[PDB]
Amino acid sequence: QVQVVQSGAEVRKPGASVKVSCKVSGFTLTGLSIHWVRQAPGKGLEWMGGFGPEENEIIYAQKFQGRVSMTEDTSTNTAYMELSSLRSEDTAVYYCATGGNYYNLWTGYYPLAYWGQGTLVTVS
């Protein structure tokens, strides 16, 4: 069994940065096994980043062109998502989502078996 624990609640300003940590305990960290998904209260989920069948990019979903950075430290077993230039609807909930130890080789379509608790970043 693996437990995934996110960072704490973090209040920033318009134009600041955020570094959400993701503690993982229960397997060893690869560099692909963690996606990052935002949900805004009032609508559904939205994929911030993660890996698929294009062979380097932890892909940024067509609205993160210069303000995001996603880097995964495999030695500390902790991920670190970064987002700068916080805007009007960057007031939402983040999720460090993680696929398990199941038939991964190909890493395009594997879903998110294990989960954090949901960190909240508010913009004041």
Partner: peptide
């Protein structure tokens, strides 16, 4: 509940259902 899959076209990546 949310359907979720990845997009193989260069409409880039992982998608999730609306609501």
């Amino acid at each position: 509940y949310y359907c979720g899959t990845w997009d193989s076209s260069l409409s880039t990546g992982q998608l999730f259902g609306g609501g």
